[PDB]
Write a protein that binds this DNA or RNA. Structure first.
Ligand SMILES: [Mg+2]
Ligand SMILES: [Mg+2]
Ligand SMILES: [Mg+2]
Ligand SMILES: [Mg+2]
Ligand SMILES: [Mg+2]
Ligand SMILES: [Mg+2]
Ligand SMILES: [Mg+2]
Ligand SMILES: [Mg+2]
Ligand SMILES: [Mg+2]
Ligand SMILES: [Mg+2]
Ligand SMILES: [Mg+2]
Ligand SMILES: [Mg+2]
Ligand SMILES: [Mg+2]
Ligand SMILES: [Mg+2]
Ligand SMILES: [Mg+2]
Ligand SMILES: [Mg+2]
Ligand SMILES: [Mg+2]
Ligand SMILES: [Mg+2]
Ligand SMILES: [Mg+2]
Ligand SMILES: [Mg+2]
Ligand SMILES: [Mg+2]
Ligand SMILES: [Mg+2]
Ligand SMILES: [Mg+2]
Ligand SMILES: [Mg+2]
Ligand SMILES: [Mg+2]
Ligand SMILES: [Mg+2]
Ligand SMILES: [Mg+2]
Ligand SMILES: [Mg+2]
Ligand SMILES: [Mg+2]
Ligand SMILES: [Mg+2]
Ligand SMILES: [Mg+2]
Ligand SMILES: [Mg+2]
Ligand SMILES: [Mg+2]
Ligand SMILES: [Mg+2]
Ligand SMILES: [Mg+2]
Ligand SMILES: [Mg+2]
Ligand SMILES: [Mg+2]
Ligand SMILES: [Mg+2]
Ligand SMILES: [Mg+2]
Ligand SMILES: [Mg+2]
Ligand SMILES: [Mg+2]
Ligand SMILES: [Mg+2]
Ligand SMILES: [Mg+2]
Ligand SMILES: [Mg+2]
Ligand SMILES: [Mg+2]
Ligand SMILES: [Mg+2]
Ligand SMILES: [Mg+2]
Ligand SMILES: [Mg+2]
Ligand SMILES: [Mg+2]
Ligand SMILES: [Mg+2]
Ligand SMILES: [Mg+2]
Ligand SMILES: [Mg+2]
Ligand SMILES: [Mg+2]
Ligand SMILES: [Mg+2]
Ligand SMILES: [Mg+2]
Ligand SMILES: [Mg+2]
Ligand SMILES: [Mg+2]
Ligand SMILES: [Mg+2]
Ligand SMILES: [Mg+2]
Ligand SMILES: [Mg+2]
Ligand SMILES: [Mg+2]
Ligand SMILES: [Mg+2]
Ligand SMILES: [Mg+2]
Ligand SMILES: [Mg+2]
Ligand SMILES: [Mg+2]
Ligand SMILES: [Mg+2]
Ligand SMILES: [Mg+2]
Ligand SMILES: [Mg+2]
Ligand SMILES: [Mg+2]
Ligand SMILES: [Mg+2]
Ligand SMILES: [Mg+2]
Ligand SMILES: [Mg+2]
Ligand SMILES: [Mg+2]
Ligand SMILES: [Mg+2]
Ligand SMILES: [Mg+2]
Ligand SMILES: [Mg+2]
Ligand SMILES: [Mg+2]
Ligand SMILES: [Mg+2]
Ligand SMILES: [Mg+2]
Ligand SMILES: [Mg+2]
Ligand SMILES: [Mg+2]
Ligand SMILES: [Mg+2]
Ligand SMILES: [Mg+2]
Ligand SMILES: [Mg+2]
Ligand SMILES: [Mg+2]
Ligand SMILES: [Mg+2]
Ligand SMILES: [Mg+2]
Ligand SMILES: [Mg+2]
Ligand SMILES: [Mg+2]
Ligand SMILES: [Mg+2]
Ligand SMILES: [Mg+2]
Ligand SMILES: [Mg+2]
Ligand SMILES: [Mg+2]
Ligand SMILES: [Mg+2]
Ligand SMILES: [Mg+2]
Ligand SMILES: [Mg+2]
Ligand SMILES: [Mg+2]
Ligand SMILES: [Mg+2]
Ligand SMILES: [Mg+2]
Ligand SMILES: [Mg+2]
Ligand SMILES: [Mg+2]
Ligand SMILES: [Mg+2]
Ligand SMILES: [Mg+2]
Ligand SMILES: [Mg+2]
Ligand SMILES: [Mg+2]
Ligand SMILES: [Mg+2]
Ligand SMILES: [Mg+2]
Ligand SMILES: [Mg+2]
Ligand SMILES: [Mg+2]
Ligand SMILES: [Mg+2]
Ligand SMILES: [Mg+2]
Ligand SMILES: [Mg+2]
Ligand SMILES: [Mg+2]
Ligand SMILES: [Mg+2]
Ligand SMILES: [Mg+2]
Ligand SMILES: [Mg+2]
Ligand SMILES: [Mg+2]
Ligand SMILES: [Mg+2]
Ligand SMILES: [Mg+2]
Ligand SMILES: [Mg+2]
Ligand SMILES: [Mg+2]
Ligand SMILES: [Mg+2]
Ligand SMILES: [Mg+2]
Ligand SMILES: [Mg+2]
Ligand SMILES: [Mg+2]
Ligand SMILES: [Mg+2]
Ligand SMILES: [Mg+2]
Ligand SMILES: [Mg+2]
Ligand SMILES: [Mg+2]
Ligand SMILES: [Mg+2]
Ligand SMILES: [Mg+2]
Ligand SMILES: [Mg+2]
Ligand SMILES: [Mg+2]
Ligand SMILES: [Mg+2]
Ligand SMILES: [Mg+2]
Ligand SMILES: [Mg+2]
Ligand SMILES: [Mg+2]
Ligand SMILES: [Mg+2]
Ligand SMILES: [Mg+2]
Ligand SMILES: [Mg+2]
Ligand SMILES: [Mg+2]
Ligand SMILES: [Mg+2]
Ligand SMILES: [Mg+2]
Ligand SMILES: [Mg+2]
Ligand SMILES: [Mg+2]
Ligand SMILES: [Mg+2]
Ligand SMILES: [Mg+2]
Ligand SMILES: [Mg+2]
Ligand SMILES: [Mg+2]
Ligand SMILES: [Mg+2]
Ligand SMILES: [Mg+2]
Ligand SMILES: [Mg+2]
Ligand SMILES: [Mg+2]
Ligand SMILES: [Mg+2]
Length: 275
RNA sequence: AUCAGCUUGUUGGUGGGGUGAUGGCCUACCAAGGCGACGACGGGUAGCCGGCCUGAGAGGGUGACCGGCCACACUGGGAC
RNA sequence: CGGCCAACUACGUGCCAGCAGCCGCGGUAAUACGUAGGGUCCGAGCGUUGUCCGGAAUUACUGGGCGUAAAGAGCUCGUA
RNA sequence: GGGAGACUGGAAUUCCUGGUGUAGCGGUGGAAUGCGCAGAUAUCAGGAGGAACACCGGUGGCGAAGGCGGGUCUCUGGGCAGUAACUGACGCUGAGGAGCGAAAGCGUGGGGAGCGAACAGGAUUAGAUACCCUGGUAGUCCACGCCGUAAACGGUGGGUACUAGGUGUGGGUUUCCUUCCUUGGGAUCCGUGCCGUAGCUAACGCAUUAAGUACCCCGCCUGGGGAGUACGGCCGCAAGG
RNA sequence: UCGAAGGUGGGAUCGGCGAUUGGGACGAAGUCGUAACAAGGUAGCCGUACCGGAAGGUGCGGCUGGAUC
RNA sequence: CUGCUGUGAAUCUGCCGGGACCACCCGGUAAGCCUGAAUACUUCCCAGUGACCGAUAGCGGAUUAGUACCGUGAGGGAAU
RNA sequence: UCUACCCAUGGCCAGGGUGAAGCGCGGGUAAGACCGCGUGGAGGCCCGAACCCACUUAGGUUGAAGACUGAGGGGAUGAG
RNA sequence: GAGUGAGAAUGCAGGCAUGAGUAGCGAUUAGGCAAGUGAGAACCUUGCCCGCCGAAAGACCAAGGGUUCCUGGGCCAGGCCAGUCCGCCCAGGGUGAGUCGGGACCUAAGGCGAGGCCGACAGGCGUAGUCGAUGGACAACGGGUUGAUAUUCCCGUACCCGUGUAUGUGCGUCCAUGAUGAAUCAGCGGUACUAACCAUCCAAAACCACCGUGACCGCACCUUUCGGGGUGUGGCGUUGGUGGGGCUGCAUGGGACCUUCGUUGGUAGUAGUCAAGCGAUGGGGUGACGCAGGAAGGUAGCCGUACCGGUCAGUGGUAAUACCGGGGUAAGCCUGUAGGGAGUCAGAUAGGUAAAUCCGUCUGGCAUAUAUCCUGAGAGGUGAUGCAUAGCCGAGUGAGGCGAAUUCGGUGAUCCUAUGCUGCCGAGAAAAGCCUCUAGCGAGGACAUACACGGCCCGUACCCCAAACCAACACAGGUGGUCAGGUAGAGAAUACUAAGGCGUACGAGUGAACUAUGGUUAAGGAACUCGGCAAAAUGCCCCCGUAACUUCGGGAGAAGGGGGACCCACAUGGCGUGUAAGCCUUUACGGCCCAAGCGUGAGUGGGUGGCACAAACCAGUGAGAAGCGACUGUUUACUAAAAACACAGGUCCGUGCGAAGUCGCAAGACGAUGUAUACGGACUGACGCCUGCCCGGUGCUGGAAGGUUAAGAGGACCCG
RNA sequence: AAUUCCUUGUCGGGUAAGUUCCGACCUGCACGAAUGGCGUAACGACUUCUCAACUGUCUCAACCAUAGACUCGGCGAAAU
RNA sequence: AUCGUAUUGGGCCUCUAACCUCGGACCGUAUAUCCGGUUCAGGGACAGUGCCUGGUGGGUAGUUUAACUGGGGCGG
């Protein structure tokens, strides 16, 4: 759950963490690890592509079976629900009957011992990936794909995931966490159940070291920025810039969504906030 | 209790000194407890009693005089 | 010497000067203010003042209540 | 309708989408701020989301008290009648202590249809920082914690034994006119309304579900303000208690 | 060794005073107001939160110590 | 005249040139292709010339010369 | 090749204290919450050298040095 | 005909003056004397004391420089002075590797890049690949040597990489034993194709009865003078078309008739393949990795003891009970302890881009055995009759021969087991090598041993916290890694010392001011000053006791006080370690204790000396208020370190995935190999209370109904 | 007040005196609620004030041993 | 615009054959997430890309911001 840390030092007074009692193994599988490195917020070209992030704690990579489609009709027990920091959620390894173990996203309330099926015959216990032909309308879903068989991309937020609304014709309607409705094929791949670590939103950061570890760099406010560096720069004292806030990269607040996407016709309306 | 914990010779045993007389009265060595919500330790007031006044009684108030003790002798100590 | 409380009339100023333990007494005709008489109480003492009890069953053990005047804690489990 | 979790239903409001359909719709003691001519109101079809369950529904049931009601499942407490098999003084109340607790308020993270403090306008008045109208931010919903106060009222602590009745309701055992249908008649215990004796009370009034007559323990009160306030102590992140 | 007096240093209690401020009661009479007592002209009150010179107003929940029907 | 972008002609009473524009007459035939001679230039070689300098001049360099040296750079850059 | 940032691979931090969760025992409950006792060394924790900084002062300022030296000064298991 | 006339432009280049023989001669260590060479000696050489560093100011490496290394010659030029000396200059000499560092081995960040994509062009990208250590695989010590080089040369003993000899164990292909397995003919899943039977619920072609009455025909009453209309009844009709029976056809379950078996009855274990032994550009394992922390066993190393050799040092006493010096010895080859981990066979399954005896998974059997295997410090033996050493003899720039003892104990690491164990989150590279499996071959390979043989190229001197690198210098600066002795000590601080190297290149004198570095000072203690700036002061360990406030951690080492030296006794005490010996057994590099021996803090008494017993060095000033900033942090290298910045806390907005925003005229890459509890942007800055009013202006988000307007279409009139 | 010109505002505490400081008043030229307001335990080489000790910072300087300054010997600078 | 004859472009709904796909499966390939081709599957006469123009456009660029003045600036 959530465990709050006692104030031993003035720095870690407010630090509270979601204790990971949901851990079973501590040393990740060495076979599936691929060579990875912190890119430092920089491309191969050497320029800093995005500031406020980079540096920190070098970490490893592991392949997740996001698009599980190659093998079907075989069951798998939950091997060990381990901790992968490269995601907000957790990964629970599976012993499939063919002996080919792949990592998958651990759904909410998953504990070691449940049997998971991936295919048409799969039931409604969480972790079962199956096309929309075999799912009731109205069930909460996660790790949702966009086409019948091109790899799953969406619905992997910890705690709130996409909810299926209804099927009409050959197009299916999906409700977004933002409260929006997206039209998607009735043959895409989607799983059942919410994603775990819902209590992760109750994490309290704590200090700056954790944050350089996590990746982000300290944020430099524009009002003290130099005027050449930023439109908010300059001033003798504290000033807001004398104009509406603007990213120093030229454009102010506003529309950024370029229309006319191939899935733009597959969207009914855009998000509305604070209702 | 608009005072909840107090105490370290403090508590208990043994061995010594001590005093007219027993005794942590004093010393050494052993054990950790005794007193505590059937009000401890703290705070304010005040000499106690036979008596006096009041009240049918219960009770309440009080310690004039006398008398039975207690404590003191400008303040604090000590001893022959 | 108004009623509590046995003892009243006249004269002098009228919301002034003043009385007083509770109620309370004077705004031109006071048995309540001041003076006279008159009467009452007490008496070698007479009142005022302060402390204490009684009435005070007004801390109710004898001897109070908790619907509205003051009061049933919000209600249970339950240690001593 | 005792509590908790999950699943599920319909009506209604609002919003969105698409027809039809035209200049008004909403409003009060009267009118104007409000939305329309960019197509409102009305009305049909569909969808979305949130809250709450109209009738049954009552001076009726349960819970110790706050309180509790759309269905369905899951688990569970309390109470009642008969046989009385068994335990054989285990009963009661309970200072300090501990647990539950209306609404509002606070933190974190979500939700948010309607309603609605605060705040804007429009209206009345000499005056409105109100009553009225149009809007609507907390909150009202969910989960975890908190505060622990109400005219928290039956303004009456609990338990036991006794003391005349009449009239309704609910639950269960029996017996008899006996169709053996019948609130038929009778006996019994528990709960809950109303009116009434003796009695009590200053009166209103209570009257077997006592304020009657007693027993056991517990809290509370000693003229009105000051004041349920200052200081001190305890709890709470704070409001505060 | 003990030992009264004296001096070092910080904790409690009783206090006395203290600019100014907060609150209360008594004066009497004046302005601002209509709050409550009759369905007091918005039923009252209680707990609570917000608001306003002021009595008060509103929201939510609770009682009738509320009158008509 | 050429180019980017769209349109788009005739084959000879066809066209475009004749310095916004055309009737009659006047001069040449576009979308295909190339072609020596006069010209510009001199890192190199040869032969000469100079009212050009004679070692702070003349090329930075008559001599260890783009050497020493400075600068990690593109480079700069000596005196003798 | 300094400095700013990042990337990958190595290395560095003498010594001494503070004592979270967790763990077992005895209380507390019906289960808790909680209460003490023994292990724990978690900490951008504490004191303090190597190391990294540069707060004060003096000297120097045609210095030993085109930004230091000497006394003190801060971090010193980490945003190093 | 002029490059034709200088005195200046903080002019240019060269030369030379004064300031002037003035300042300085480069630190917190310091010298003096003797003898020697030399023409000259504080500075060089040799001897004795003194001084300084000694986590360096000693000894090694990397980067860097390149002859500064050694020897011989000389001292006009350089060394801040003379200099016989030098890191000066001239000549000669000096660097020895299968095993130490790189290449023939492989990869990270990143660079190059065939084809290819994009780009007028130049070009930019990146695939297959190839480069790229700061990483990983893979092989040493003691002693000795001359005037300079030593893990390289020699002696002594080994190792592991790679090529060959052939004999000995020994194996099939061309014979054939084994284990099996699999692609062929004949039918069945009371379940239940098709006429029914028993039981149950409902109703299409309205029969009976009642009621309501689209509309029609009307009887009686009311109503306006009669009319519309209203009230009760009758005849239907139903705004609101079944029952009954039969043939026939279809639909639902039964047994059975022809085709679908209980894999063999002959053949064809006759013929065709093959597993040795190498075997992959392929597949799979292994190789393969964090921070922090404690405990245990050991080692380097240190201190004492036995033993071994020597000692008489002009001083009062100690001639051995005392003193000084030794008291060493590797790699490798055996043994496999403490300790860290892990279980064994049979059969089938297709999951690992093809197949698998390999890697996984499921059925079963065997297993809690210190069974079995791997790893693994250390100790013991060999290595070693060897080497070396304290010292004895002749012999001096120096060489040679001989050569004693070589054990116990204790202390003890930051070193080894350890890439381990326990716990935390912030969850900890790649490939080569190695083991093994098959695909594609195949008539000769596999294992040991006597023997002669063959193992590449390059670095190898010297300096390296400095006069040899970077700073223009022989500069008070900077520079990464490895060795870490003794006494006090908590220690790598600090003080003094060993090994070892220096007194670092201007000196000799004179009580001047004055400047700089320090010490002390009557008495007052901030009266100077902007400020207690600077100075001064406390400072260590163990105890006793510590407030206001608070987020219950703190504040707090709060403040303050006491003890601290030496000797003796308690005390042959307690503690650790551990021999002989004892106890025991799966007998071994075994568990228990441990007299003896060694080391050892703590306290209480008694006594003693000084003014002072943490006496040196080293080593917090404390307290009370108020402002800003929550705190640790970072910055104006070289005038300013804060109230600035940043940081965790929150808010708002934009972001639906080849996302937003970027870098890029583009491919492409980051974002992210992440996916609205995630990313970017902006503002504030922990935490408590909160965060009021205002949408005219400017921005942003909605609705474009009206008017204005581009380009392009369109050809009225008019001129010629 | 990090905002206040008059202003050393007025009043109270500290000293002999306090234009600084601390605590209040509001006459806020020209505070103010995310360019955030008010407090806040802890920290700060931050800012300001007071206190005990301490001292040559001072009253008022004196002496002492260093390294220069001085003379001699060797080499030998510059700003202008 | 020349309710039974005419006016050539707008508005929509469709289908695949232009076009798109960072969708799948194969191949070059013995190894290749690049690239190219085929098939299937999704969008589709749209998106995309030019040419012209209208808008927005301190993100970027080149500039300007007088003189007189009893010092300048503010005044005139
Ligand atoms: Mg915090
Ligand atoms: Mg990876
Ligand atoms: Mg950022
Ligand atoms: Mg890094
Ligand atoms: Mg996670
Ligand atoms: Mg910012
Ligand atoms: Mg800035
Ligand atoms: Mg700008
Ligand atoms: Mg600025
Ligand atoms: Mg400003
Ligand atoms: Mg804006
Ligand atoms: Mg949305
Ligand atoms: Mg005694
Ligand atoms: Mg004794
Ligand atoms: Mg009495
Ligand atoms: Mg009495
Ligand atoms: Mg008495
Ligand atoms: Mg007497
Ligand atoms: Mg007596
Ligand atoms: Mg006395
Ligand atoms: Mg006395
Ligand atoms: Mg009378
Ligand atoms: Mg009388
Ligand atoms: Mg009179
Ligand atoms: Mg008389
Ligand atoms: Mg009395
Ligand atoms: Mg009684
Ligand atoms: Mg009473
Ligand atoms: Mg009452
Ligand atoms: Mg009560
Ligand atoms: Mg109460
Ligand atoms: Mg629940
Ligand atoms: Mg509609
Ligand atoms: Mg909603
Ligand atoms: Mg009880
Ligand atoms: Mg009880
Ligand atoms: Mg009690
Ligand atoms: Mg009680
Ligand atoms: Mg509780
Ligand atoms: Mg509510
Ligand atoms: Mg609130
Ligand atoms: Mg909350
Ligand atoms: Mg919330
Ligand atoms: Mg509303
Ligand atoms: Mg508004
Ligand atoms: Mg109630
Ligand atoms: Mg009660
Ligand atoms: Mg009772
Ligand atoms: Mg009666
Ligand atoms: Mg009655
Ligand atoms: Mg009763
Ligand atoms: Mg009573
Ligand atoms: Mg009261
Ligand atoms: Mg208090
Ligand atoms: Mg006072
Ligand atoms: Mg009223
Ligand atoms: Mg009114
Ligand atoms: Mg009212
Ligand atoms: Mg009212
Ligand atoms: Mg209230
Ligand atoms: Mg209100
Ligand atoms: Mg209510
Ligand atoms: Mg009433
Ligand atoms: Mg032609
Ligand atoms: Mg030509
Ligand atoms: Mg160069
Ligand atoms: Mg600890
Ligand atoms: Mg705990
Ligand atoms: Mg400095
Ligand atoms: Mg100076
Ligand atoms: Mg100097
Ligand atoms: Mg320089
Ligand atoms: Mg100093
Ligand atoms: Mg740090
Ligand atoms: Mg000339
Ligand atoms: Mg000149
Ligand atoms: Mg000059
Ligand atoms: Mg001169
Ligand atoms: Mg001089
Ligand atoms: Mg000099
Ligand atoms: Mg020097
Ligand atoms: Mg000499
Ligand atoms: Mg030293
Ligand atoms: Mg050191
Ligand atoms: Mg050392
Ligand atoms: Mg190097
Ligand atoms: Mg020579
Ligand atoms: Mg010479
Ligand atoms: Mg020279
Ligand atoms: Mg030479
Ligand atoms: Mg490339
Ligand atoms: Mg190419
Ligand atoms: Mg490549
Ligand atoms: Mg390479
Ligand atoms: Mg390399
Ligand atoms: Mg060498
Ligand atoms: Mg060597
Ligand atoms: Mg790890
Ligand atoms: Mg020795
Ligand atoms: Mg497998
Ligand atoms: Mg060889
Ligand atoms: Mg070589
Ligand atoms: Mg060298
Ligand atoms: Mg060196
Ligand atoms: Mg140099
Ligand atoms: Mg030097
Ligand atoms: Mg130097
Ligand atoms: Mg260094
Ligand atoms: Mg060390
Ligand atoms: Mg020394
Ligand atoms: Mg030395
Ligand atoms: Mg001087
Ligand atoms: Mg002195
Ligand atoms: Mg003094
Ligand atoms: Mg001053
Ligand atoms: Mg303090
Ligand atoms: Mg403290
Ligand atoms: Mg302290
Ligand atoms: Mg034995
Ligand atoms: Mg045994
Ligand atoms: Mg002494
Ligand atoms: Mg800091
Ligand atoms: Mg900082
Ligand atoms: Mg900087
Ligand atoms: Mg600076
Ligand atoms: Mg600097
Ligand atoms: Mg500075
Ligand atoms: Mg700074
Ligand atoms: Mg700061
Ligand atoms: Mg910050
Ligand atoms: Mg905030
Ligand atoms: Mg923000
Ligand atoms: Mg925001
Ligand atoms: Mg507007
Ligand atoms: Mg505006
Ligand atoms: Mg036209
Ligand atoms: Mg102020
Ligand atoms: Mg100020
Ligand atoms: Mg302030
Ligand atoms: Mg001052
Ligand atoms: Mg002001
Ligand atoms: Mg202002
Ligand atoms: Mg703001
Ligand atoms: Mg602002
Ligand atoms: Mg504060
Ligand atoms: Mg002095
Ligand atoms: Mg003087
Ligand atoms: Mg002297
Ligand atoms: Mg000097
Ligand atoms: Mg001198
Ligand atoms: Mg000189
Ligand atoms: Mg001008
Ligand atoms: Mg002027
Ligand atoms: Mg002038």
């Amino acid at each position: 759950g959530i465990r709050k840390y006692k104030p031993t030092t003035p720095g870690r007074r407010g630090a509270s963490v979601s204790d990971f009692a949901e851990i079973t193994r501590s040393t990740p599988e060495k076979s599936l690890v691929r060579p990875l490195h912190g890119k430092g917020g920089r491309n191969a070209h050497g320029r800093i592509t995005t500031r406020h992030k980079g540096g920190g704690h070098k970490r490893a990579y592991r392949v997740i079976d996001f698009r599980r489609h190659d093998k079907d009709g075989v069951n798998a027990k939950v091997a060990h629900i381990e901790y992968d920091p490269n995601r907000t959620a957790n990964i629970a390894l599976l012993h499939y009957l063919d002996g080919e173990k792949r990592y998958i996203i651990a759904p909410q309330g998953l504990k070691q011992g449940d049997v998971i099926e991936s295919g048409a015959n799969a039931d409604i216990k969480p972790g079962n990936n199956l096309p929309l032909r075999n799912i009731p309308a109205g069930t909460v879903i996660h790790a949702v794909e966009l086409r019948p068989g091109g790899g799953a991309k969406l619905a992997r937020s910890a705690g709130v995931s996409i909810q299926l609304l209804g099927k009409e014709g050959t197009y299916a309607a999906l409700r977004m966490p933002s409260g929006e409705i997206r039209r998607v094929d009735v043959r895409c791949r989607a799983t059942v159940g919410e994603v775990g670590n819902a209590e992760q939103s109750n994490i309290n950061w704590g200090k700056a070291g954790r944050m350089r570890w996590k990746g982000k760099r300290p944020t430099v406010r524009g009002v003290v920025m130099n005027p050449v560096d930023h439109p908010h720069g300059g001033g003798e004292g504290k000033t807001s810039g004398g104009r509406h806030p603007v990213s120093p990269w030229g454009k102010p607040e506003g529309r950024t969504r370029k229309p006319n996407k191939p899935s733009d016709k597959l969207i009914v309306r855009r998000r509305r906030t604070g209702k």
